[PDB]
Amino acid sequence: EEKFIVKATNGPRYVVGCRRQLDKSKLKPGTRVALDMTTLTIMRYLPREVDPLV
Amino acid sequence: AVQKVVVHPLVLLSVVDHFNRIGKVGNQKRVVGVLLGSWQKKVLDVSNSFAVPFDEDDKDDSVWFLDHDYLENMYGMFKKVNARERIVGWYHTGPKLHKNDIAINELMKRYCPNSVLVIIDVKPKDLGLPTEAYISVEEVHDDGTPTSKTFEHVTSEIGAEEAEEVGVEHLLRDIKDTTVGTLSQRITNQVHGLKGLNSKLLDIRSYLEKVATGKLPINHQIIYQLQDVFNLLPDVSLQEFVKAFYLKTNDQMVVVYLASLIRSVVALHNLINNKIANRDAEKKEG
Amino acid sequence: AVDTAEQVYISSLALLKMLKHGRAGVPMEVMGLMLGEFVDDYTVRVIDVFAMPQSGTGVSVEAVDPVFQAKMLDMLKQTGRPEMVVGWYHSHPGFGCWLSGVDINTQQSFEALSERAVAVVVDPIQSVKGKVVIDAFRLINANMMVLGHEPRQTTSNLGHLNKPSIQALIHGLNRHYYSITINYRKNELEQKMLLNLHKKSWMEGLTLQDYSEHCKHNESVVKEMLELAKNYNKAVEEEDKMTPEQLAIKNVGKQDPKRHLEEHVDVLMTSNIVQCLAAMLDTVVFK
Amino acid sequence: RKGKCAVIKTSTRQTYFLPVIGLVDAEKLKPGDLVGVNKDSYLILETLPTEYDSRVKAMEVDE
Amino acid sequence: MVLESTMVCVDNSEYMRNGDFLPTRLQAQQDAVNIVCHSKTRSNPENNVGLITLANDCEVLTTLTPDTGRILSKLHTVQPKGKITFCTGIRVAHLALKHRQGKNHKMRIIAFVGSPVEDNEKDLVKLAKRLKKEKVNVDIINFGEEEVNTEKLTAFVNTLNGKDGTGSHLVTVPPGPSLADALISSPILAG
Amino acid sequence: MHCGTTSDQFLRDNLEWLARATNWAKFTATASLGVIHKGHEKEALQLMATYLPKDTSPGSAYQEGGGLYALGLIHANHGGDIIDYLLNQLKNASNDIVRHGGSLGLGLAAMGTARQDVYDLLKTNLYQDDAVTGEAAGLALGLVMLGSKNAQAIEDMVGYAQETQHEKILRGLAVGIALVMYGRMEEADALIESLCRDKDPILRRSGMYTVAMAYCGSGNNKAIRRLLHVAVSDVNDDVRRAAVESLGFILFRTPEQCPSVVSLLSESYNPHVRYGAAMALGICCAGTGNKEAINLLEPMTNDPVNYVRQGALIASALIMIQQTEITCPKVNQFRQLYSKVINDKHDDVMAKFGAILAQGILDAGGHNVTISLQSRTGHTHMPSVVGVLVFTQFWFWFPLSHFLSLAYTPTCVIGLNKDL
Numbered sequence A: 001e002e003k004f005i006v007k008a009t010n011g012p013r014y015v016v017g018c019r020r021q022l023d024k025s026k027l028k029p030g031t032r033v034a035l036d037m038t039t040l041t042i043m044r045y046l047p048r049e050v051d052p053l054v
Numbered sequence B: 001a002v003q004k005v006v007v008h009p010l011v012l013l014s015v016v017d018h019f020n021r022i023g024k025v026g027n028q029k030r031v032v033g034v035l036l037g038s039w040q041k042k043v044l045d046v047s048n049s050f051a052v053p054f055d056e057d058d059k060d061d062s063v064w065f066l067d068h069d070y071l072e073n074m075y076g077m078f079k080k081v082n083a084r085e086r087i088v089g090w091y092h093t094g095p096k097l098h099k100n101d102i103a104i105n106e107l108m109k110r111y112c113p114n115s116v117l118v119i120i121d122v123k124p125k126d127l128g129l130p131t132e133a134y135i136s137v138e139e140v141h142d143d144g145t146p147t148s149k150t151f152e153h154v155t156s157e158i159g160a161e162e163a164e165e166v167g168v169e170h171l172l173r174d175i176k177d178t179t180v181g182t183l184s185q186r187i188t189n190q191v192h193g194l195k196g197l198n199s200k201l202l203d204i205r206s207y208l209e210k211v212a213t214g215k216l217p218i219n220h221q222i223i224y225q226l227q228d229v230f231n232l233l234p235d236v237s238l239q240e241f242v243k244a245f246y247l248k249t250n251d252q253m254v255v256v257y258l259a260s261l262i263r264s265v266v267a268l269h270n271l272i273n274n275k276i277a278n279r280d281a282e283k284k285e286g
Numbered sequence C: 001a002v003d004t005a006e007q008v009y010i011s012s013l014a015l016l017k018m019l020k021h022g023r024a025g026v027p028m029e030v031m032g033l034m035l036g037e038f039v040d041d042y043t044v045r046v047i048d049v050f051a052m053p054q055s056g057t058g059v060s061v062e063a064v065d066p067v068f069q070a071k072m073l074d075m076l077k078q079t080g081r082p083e084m085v086v087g088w089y090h091s092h093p094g095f096g097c098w099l100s101g102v103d104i105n106t107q108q109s110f111e112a113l114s115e116r117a118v119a120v121v122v123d124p125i126q127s128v129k130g131k132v133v134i135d136a137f138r139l140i141n142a143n144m145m146v147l148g149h150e151p152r153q154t155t156s157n158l159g160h161l162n163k164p165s166i167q168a169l170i171h172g173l174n175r176h177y178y179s180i181t182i183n184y185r186k187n188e189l190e191q192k193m194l195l196n197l198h199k200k201s202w203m204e205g206l207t208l209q210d211y212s213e214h215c216k217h218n219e220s221v222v223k224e225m226l227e228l229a230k231n232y233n234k235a236v237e238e239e240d241k242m243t244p245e246q247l248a249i250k251n252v253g254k255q256d257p258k259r260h261l262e263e264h265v266d267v268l269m270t271s272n273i274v275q276c277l278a279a280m281l282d283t284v285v286f287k
Numbered sequence D: 001r002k003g004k005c006a007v008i009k010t011s012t013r014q015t016y017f018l019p020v021i022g023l024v025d026a027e028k029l030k031p032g033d034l035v036g037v038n039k040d041s042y043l044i045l046e047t048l049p050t051e052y053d054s055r056v057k058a059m060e061v062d063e
Numbered sequence E: 001m002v003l004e005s006t007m008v009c010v011d012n013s014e015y016m017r018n019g020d021f022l023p024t025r026l027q028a029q030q031d032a033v034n035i036v037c038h039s040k041t042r043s044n045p046e047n048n049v050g051l052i053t054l055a056n057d058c059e060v061l062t063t064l065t066p067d068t069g070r071i072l073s074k075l076h077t078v079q080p081k082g083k084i085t086f087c088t089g090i091r092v093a094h095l096a097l098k099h100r101q102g103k104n105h106k107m108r109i110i111a112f113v114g115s116p117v118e119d120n121e122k123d124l125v126k127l128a129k130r131l132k133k134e135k136v137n138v139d140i141i142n143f144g145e146e147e148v149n150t151e152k153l154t155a156f157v158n159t160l161n162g163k164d165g166t167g168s169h170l171v172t173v174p175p176g177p178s179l180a181d182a183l184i185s186s187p188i189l190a191g
Numbered sequence F: 001m002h003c004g005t006t007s008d009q010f011l012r013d014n015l016e017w018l019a020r021a022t023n024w025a026k027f028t029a030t031a032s033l034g035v036i037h038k039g040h041e042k043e044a045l046q047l048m049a050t051y052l053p054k055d056t057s058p059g060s061a062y063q064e065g066g067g068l069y070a071l072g073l074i075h076a077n078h079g080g081d082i083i084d085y086l087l088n089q090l091k092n093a094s095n096d097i098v099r100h101g102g103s104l105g106l107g108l109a110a111m112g113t114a115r116q117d118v119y120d121l122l123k124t125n126l127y128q129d130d131a132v133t134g135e136a137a138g139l140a141l142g143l144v145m146l147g148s149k150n151a152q153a154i155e156d157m158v159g160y161a162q163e164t165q166h167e168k169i170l171r172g173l174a175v176g177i178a179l180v181m182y183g184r185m186e187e188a189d190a191l192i193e194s195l196c197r198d199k200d201p202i203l204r205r206s207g208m209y210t211v212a213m214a215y216c217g218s219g220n221n222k223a224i225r226r227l228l229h230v231a232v233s234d235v236n237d238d239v240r241r242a243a244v245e246s247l248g249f250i251l252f253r254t255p256e257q258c259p260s261v262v263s264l265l266s267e268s269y270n271p272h273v274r275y276g277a278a279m280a281l282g283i284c285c286a287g288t289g290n291k292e293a294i295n296l297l298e299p300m301t302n303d304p305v306n307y308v309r310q311g312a313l314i315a316s317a318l319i320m321i322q323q324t325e326i327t328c329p330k331v332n333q334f335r336q337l338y339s340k341v342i343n344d345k346h347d348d349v350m351a352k353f354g355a356i357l358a359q360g361i362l363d364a365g366g367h368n369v370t371i372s373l374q375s376r377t378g379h380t381h382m383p384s385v386v387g388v389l390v391f392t393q394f395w396f397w398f399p400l401s402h403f404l405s406l407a408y409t410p411t412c413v414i415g416l417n418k419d420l
């Protein structure tokens, strides 16, 4: 529940932790998130969209 | 407003530098340094700091010497190299709170935002926590005294984020980590009585002295809450807690069965190899 | 034509400034300047270390502003910092701590004043948090290729200089590019102030606050850890019931890498917290 | 604490994360190319609309 | 040229806006600071000039620096509060002389006194003994008066002024509608 | 190999192999020349002056400094000392040659004299805060202060220690206050016990080096408690590798009891205790025939760390001297010691240094001269212990190994009836 598996767009997969600010609401699977190069922390998520939806 | 603060050891080692670059002149007064931190979030986080030439007078206490151009130049260049940290307050190395600190802090109250104050010791002989966060806010008093600057104690913690833990751990090579178990627990359980004994014994003596030999109101109103909370535990007869001693002592029995049984399991390989190895090595030695 | 055995003294000032500068060690090239005093030939001591503002060009001689450098150095001269510059440092993330042509060119240009010209490259990006081993770099003379490379006496410390033994950078680029040993120094004020400061950083405020928290959490939270601990204990005993068959058949050789002993010893160590804190509750209840 | 972000795609087929930043933007915020970017910070500094597929861009270039 | 530090102390009390004398002579003595700082700049531009008042809570308005471009701006917003303070007015600069950059700059401090002195003769002889002890050039300029100009201040200067050869001078201005610039520029201290 | 025999004909083959590099190698070459010939009142000074009696201005001053240090090696403990001339030659102002080499030579020639003159000029020689002339000043002050025990000297040196940042001054005054302490068993208890808790690790080594010669003869079973207690308990490897040298210096009486308690230190946790323990086996079993270290030398000579290999080759070199092959099978260590100079291409640069340096121990004097830690009556020789401890002090300063000739005790008989 604290640390899960992430899938990067480039192809290699990683595992990250949980930031003390965010909660487990958006941490549920199936939601695209964002990561950091240092410590692989999570600042916020990334809501999906489409091309014609814009 | 602010519940707790976070002070990194980098500023206190910068106080070690304050004690290093003295030059053996014979002054060693309360050198005031410009404390820096992050006032954006509710919690305060000190990353680094710098100093300003500060000199007082021998007799007159109201003499204090600061600098605005040096503060705007060091803060301007420091903001140019790192804009994520801004001015927050200051701190002095003197062990005693002088009257002039309201005028020294008043300058950074006018020009800078609400400054936090930190009193430390010139000699690291105090067993207690050297850092005490004192917020500079004016409070209304019930006795009717005029409103003045009041230094309320804010709790503080000494932590390092990423690298200073590694640097301190490599430079020491003597301190130990958490290491739950026998030694780290029993050391605290041995020296803790002195850790409270030096504090309480060091405080209640001057306290009892200022009880009879005290004037210039020391806020005697809080003494009623002091002795009140001290009298909130009127030597309970332990009648209701007997069953709690049966519960904790029953858990003690659980630890007894775990120790005896598990150690009895550990005795297997020892009390088997001691025979099968010795008798076979002996019968096959010659 | 003479050479000695030099050694760079590194205090906690430059170390912690290179740790905060390593936290600010973004992939973009950074600049820094070291200060100190030269007392003799074969010793060098660093005291003052600060950072420099980043630039789009990166590490270069053009990025070093002489009026800004001399201005800040003068502001250090009006204060209690009467030390001259001794060298410049930077960060090399990713591609290794080695020095490119630009770095050796600005090193050749910056070594005209100081004959020593200490160079340090910090790289905490790919370095694990277990070790903070840092190395100082030096520039060799191009005219010494005919004679011996490094006529440095006291070859004992080279065994301590062999710790950075990467098989590509040190001797992969050791030609015309060598290094120097690094030692530390700590007085009693740093020892007791930083030692008691770190012990207090792992201790409480009054040191009596969080004791009763665990002493009374032994009855509420640790009970779950004791039941789960017994679940692991029985979860190993279910195999320890099958162990005396194999031990009753073969008795020769060991095939299972699991010891089944030290883990249970650690379980007993975690279980002894109840015993050690029972006396604590006895003291809190007593007086 | 306002929500504002954008999706980036580099020429080397690498996707990163960054919010909408830069100077005062009037014709920006559109899905275009040829934007300002530093070495590894990946910030937006100078946005200018770009072509490519020059076969249609240089249809009839007459002054 | 001349290597010395300049410290000026200006009065911020309400005694400087009376309509009998010059029309708010605060601007006139501000122009005096302008002509002495530009005159010292023409003589030696490396001299540093500090700015501070004599109020109860003394505040360093400008650090000792030769750049007067921002000092011209700092001469405004005088904050006309308080009446006079002498002890910490002397101690706030004569003890702060050690914070200067150039150690070769001699010690010279002037002061614009626009209010009657509240300290008795004992503080005058103790402070005069301190200033004569540390050997700092002190120029006393008294603008405006209520009682006689110099009764105990005469002995204050005579006991304060050491090194009779080319030592310090006393500036006593009489009442008159003329400007104070040419009257204070008469001694050798100006130029 | 050429000690005592004055055989300069080996160094007369060519001059391009010695003076080819201007560095300390020529100083160690002239000092080695001082180790070659010894006991000459005319051919020594005449031989040193005949090298360049043309302009009285040598381009390399290491020839002069090596002439003073070598002269001090020649006139060690002689009754016809030229010290009176060495004061007028030391009065000359020069750059660190007469200071370091002149201080070492003059202090070695004046060893045991306890003269206040060399104390005064030595103090004014160390008053320049330099680490090299203060290191040689300490090495000379310890030698000349043998048994003097001056009141203000110890407090002046320990007071001079913490007021400087250099390390060679702290090791030079460390050996200086270490060698001065001889026969003070009943005196230095509070001094060493008080100086043991010092914050300086160099002075912490100085307490053990100081208590080493004070408790010689296995007369105190108390100092070993804190010797091994600081060898295992302390986190810094300086007192850990410098600890057991005092253990061997006090337990030099019995050769059998040492490997039983240092066998655990043969393969210790860190390589520093392995190296210092290798020095302990080197000094405790020297001159004896105990195989309890020889059978343990085979695990010491094979390890990825070059420290235990160097100290293993030195410790193996200190035992094979004065031993015949028919008594004990030394073929293993002879062959593995001979394979190091041919295997030097694939070994470390210092491993071959300690390898051939270890090979020079057996060939010393052509098997004629040897070393001994005690005399025939059982008493121990002071210059032998000094020579072996300074010989072990080559780790910090390699040119200090030249004092090994002071411990050379030739084994022979004398049937001289009349003087002539």
Ligand SMILES: [Zn+2]
Pocket (backbone or CB within 6 Å): C095
């Ligand atoms: Zn790069």
